[PDB]
Amino acid sequence: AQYEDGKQYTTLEKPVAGAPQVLEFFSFFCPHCYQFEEVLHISDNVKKKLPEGVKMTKYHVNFMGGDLGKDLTQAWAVAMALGVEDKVTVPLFEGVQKTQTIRSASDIRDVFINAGIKGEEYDAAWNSFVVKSLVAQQEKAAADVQLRGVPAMFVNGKYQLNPQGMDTSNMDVFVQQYADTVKYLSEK
Ligand SMILES: Cc1cc(Oc2ccc(CC(=O)N3CCN(C)C(=O)C3)cc2)ccc1C#N
Numbered sequence: 256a257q258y259e260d261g262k263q264y265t266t267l268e269k270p271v272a273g274a275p276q277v278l279e280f281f282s283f284f285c286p287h288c289y290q291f292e293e294v295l296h297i298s299d300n301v302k303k304k305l306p307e308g309v310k311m312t313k314y315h316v317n318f319m320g321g322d323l324g325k326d327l328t329q330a331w332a333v334a335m336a337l338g339v340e341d342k343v344t345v346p347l348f349e350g351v352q353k354t355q356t357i358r359s360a361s362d363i364r365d366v367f368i369n370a371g372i373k374g375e376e377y378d379a380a381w382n383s384f385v386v387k388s389l390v391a392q393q394e395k396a397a398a399d400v401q402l403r404g405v406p407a408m409f410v411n412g413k414y415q416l417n418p419q420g421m422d423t424s425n426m427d428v429f430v431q432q433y434a435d436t437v438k439y440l441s442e443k
Contacts, residue, residue, distance in 0.1 A: 262420045263436045267413050271399045274412025275312035277301065277437060280397060280405045283327050283351045284319040288406045292348055295430050297406070304434040305441055313340070314393040316405055320351075326360045327351075332389035333367070333380045342370040410440040 260266050279298060281288040291297040302311055315331035317324050327347070334340045346366045350357035357363055367377045380386055400409055408416040421432045 258436065258439050262417065263432070264410075264417050264440060265415045267400065267409075267415060271409075271412035274396070274399065274409065276309050276411060276441070277305065277311045278396060278400075278409040278412070279311070279313040280316055280402055280407040280409075281313065282316050282319040282324065282405050283347050283357075284324060285405045286352065289348050289352050291406050292344060295426060297408075297430065297433060300430050300434045301408075301437050304438045309441065312396075314396050316397050316402065317394070318403070319405070323351075323358070323360075323363075326363055328393055329381065329386065329390055330360075330363045330367075332386045332393065333377060335389055336380050336383070336386050337372060337376070339367070339370065339372055342372075343367055346370065408437065410437060411443070414440045414443070416440075 258264070281291070298311065298313060305311070315328040317328050320327065330343075330347070331340075334343050343366055346369065347357065347363070350362065350366055357366070364374075364377055364381075368374060399412075400407075400415070406418075410416070416433065416436060418429070418433060421429055421436075423429050
């Protein structure tokens with residue numbers, strides 16, 4: 256077959272019930288996740304190949320960057336609660352990996368302030384139990400799939416993307432192969 260288990264994707268030994276349709280995991284310390292966001296724009300191209308009525312979910316992970324890694328998972332919960340993911344994703348990536356100006360929770364907060372989120376607005380969200388719940392959801396989703404590496408994408412709680420089995424000759428070709436695989440698994 257053109258799409259084969261173990262080539263473009265793998266099948267989870269224990270599928271996860273009630274999982275988001277398309278679940279994406281990343282870390283702001285993750286180098287390929289940087290490429291996935293700024294160079295390849297994976298999630299955008301995936302969204303454009305899925306049907307218009309399908310939910311896409313992106314979660315941060317703790318297992319990279321120690322203390323700051325957990326701060327960034329809580330900050331991503333704040334971004335999701337305020338709906339400002341598209342304003343802070345790039346400055347958080349570059350603050351961690353390019354300029355290396357993000358070294359504390361205060362530095363993370365500065366990114367939101369510079370992006371236009373008011374100080375009281377950010378601090379209220381940061382300390383809200385709604386964000387506490389959103390951090391728990393990010394943790395449970397990763398723990399449900401025994402996640403130990405990022406970037407990672409899971410389709411319908413049973414299929415995991417395998418970008419290693421795709422062509423990296425051409426970056427545009429890799430993205431389309433990736434997005435077509437998600438669409439194929441979505442229709443499975
Ligand atoms: C064209 C291209 C293609 C790429 O392909 C990947 C993608 C993801 C991975 C997986 C990975 O990095 N992980 C997750 C699993 N584990 C256990 C880890 O430790 C680390 C590898 C190559 C990466 C970057 C670029 C670029 N520009």
